[PDB]
């Protein structure tokens, strides 16, 4: 039947599932991410490729979050969905949340052969861009949740009664 088994997985994610909506649509339910930093990998921006990547056993570190409490069934969805040119590797990260070191899985880029875009982009730009996106989203969702026009769920939807004339 549908039941999760023991052996919980931890997977370091960058970008994709750092939000509840995505975790809920990927698995079924919201998975808990914990802030952690992956020392030993370096994050690149990759303008042109689908939001990649981390490659090279670099002396730098990547700060992101680890998706914890992932069942082997749940974990598989990350590999199947969006992990198209990505491969699972085991990396060890520091759970920033408690400053402890934990061994996790992550997705690296299979085209890792050649270090592409080895120069790391502006963190500040990343900070502002992700912020604007979340900030707009919360403000605008609040406007809707506030109901400015007194717009109700059934009102907003153009439902049909099927009038017979």
């Amino acid at each position: 039947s549908t039941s999760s088994d023991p052996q919980s997985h931890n997977v370091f994610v960058y970008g994709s599932i750092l939000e509840p909506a995505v975790a809920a649509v990927i698995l079924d339910r919201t998975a808990d991410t914990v802030p952690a930093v992956l020392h030993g990998y370096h994050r690149y921006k990759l303008k042109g490729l689908p939001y990649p990547c981390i490659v090279s056993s670099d002396s730098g570190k990547v700060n992101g979050k680890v998706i914890t409490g992932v069942s082997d069934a749940e974990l598989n969805n990350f590999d199947v969905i969006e992990g198209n040119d990505y491969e699972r590797v085991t990396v060890e990260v520091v759970r920033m949340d408690n400053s402890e070191k934990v061994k996790v899985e992550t997705y690296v880029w299979v085209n890792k052969d050649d270090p592409r875009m080895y120069g790391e982009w502006d963190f500040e730009e990343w900070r502002v861009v992700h912020a604007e996106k979340f900030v707009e989203t919360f403000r605008k969702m609040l406007e809707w949740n506030k109901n400015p026009n007194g717009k109700s769920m059934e009102e907003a939807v153009g439902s049909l009664l099927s009038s017979g004339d």
Side-chain angles (χ1 to χ4, degrees), residues 44-53 86 109 116-117:
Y44 307 99
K45 179 185 182 175
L46 269 51
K47 55 180 293 181
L49 298 67
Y51 52 87
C53 60
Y86 291 92
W109 192 240
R116 297 174 60 190
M117 293 67 178

Side-chain angles (χ1 to χ4, degrees), residues 66-79:
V66 295
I67 309 173
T68 59
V70 186
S71 183
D72 65 278
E74 297 180 294
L75 191 293
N76 185 33
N77 201 92
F78 300 93
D79 189 280

Side-chain angles (χ1 to χ4, degrees), residues 14-15 40-63 86 108-109 111-112 114-123 126:
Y14 184 78
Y41 272 81
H42 198 126
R43 53 73 185 279
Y44 307 99
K45 179 185 182 175
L46 269 51
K47 55 180 293 181
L49 298 67
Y51 52 87
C53 60
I54 58 171
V55 297
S56 304
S57 186
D58 190 92
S59 303
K61 61 179 65 63
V62 180
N63 185 31
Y86 291 92
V108 296
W109 192 240
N111 185 267
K112 62 172 72 177
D114 176 76
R116 297 174 60 190
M117 293 67 178
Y118 58 86
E120 182 174 24
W121 191 250
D122 301 271
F123 309 104
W126 173 66

